[PDB]
């Protein structure tokens, strides 16, 4: 019950965000990859150094809206 629900919500999250992340690096910085409509892109920022709003605008603005 827990395992299938968890794996399914994981697949749903990966489908939604189209983004894979990095966890083995320190949580003070964020590494990841975005599968956008254009060329696939990296994600290298500092999670604990900028406000959540700015970084969220950074990722969700890189998504092609045109």
């Amino acid at each position: 019950v827990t395992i299938p629900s968890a794996v399914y919500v994981a697949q749903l999250y990966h489908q939604v965000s189209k983004i894979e992340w990095d966890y083995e690096c320190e949580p003070g910085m964020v590494k990841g990859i975005h599968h956008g409509p254009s060329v696939a892109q990296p994600i290298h920022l500092d999670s604990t150094q900028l406000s959540r709003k700015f970084i969220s605008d950074y990722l969700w603005s890189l998504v092609d809206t045109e």
């Binding site: 990966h14 990095d22 966890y23 892109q41 990296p42 290298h44």
Partner: protein, 199 residues
Amino acid sequence: REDFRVRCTSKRAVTEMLQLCGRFVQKLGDALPEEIREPALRDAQWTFESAVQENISINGQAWQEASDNCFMDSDIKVLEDQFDEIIVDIATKRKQYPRKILECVIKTIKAKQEILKQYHPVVHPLDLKYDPDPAPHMENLKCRGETVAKEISEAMKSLPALIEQGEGFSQVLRMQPVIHLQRIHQEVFSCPQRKWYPL
């Protein structure tokens, strides 16, 4: 003929003949008294030869001014008149015609300088006319050079976007295997011509 007078070529013979014929007057002069014979006799004889001489003409010349018969003096006079004529002619020449030709040559000099200065305007065909430069040609150069410069400046800014995208994608390729080499990460994870030809 107007000349009636007598022409003689000898004078001594004529005088001797007159003297010889005067013996008739001599005898008639002897018919006068001896006391007054000499004046009357000289009278008669001188009148005799004088009248004889006065009727004759020495080639048209007067008896008192007559001379030797070697040459005619009329010819000499005619020549001398001609000589005076030619001398006075050359005198009037050197008087007036040098001045006249001087007045002529000054006018000729004026004419020559007029002709010379009238030749100052001279025009000859030497100019080389040519068609005006082609405005449409340089306009076409302007236009397509402008569009080339426009697109070149556009490319100069567009290409670095490709550069940075390529660098980012190289980083993506670098990150891809390790991310797929991780355990829980995969746990979460689990011909142009054909386009050209419309088929």
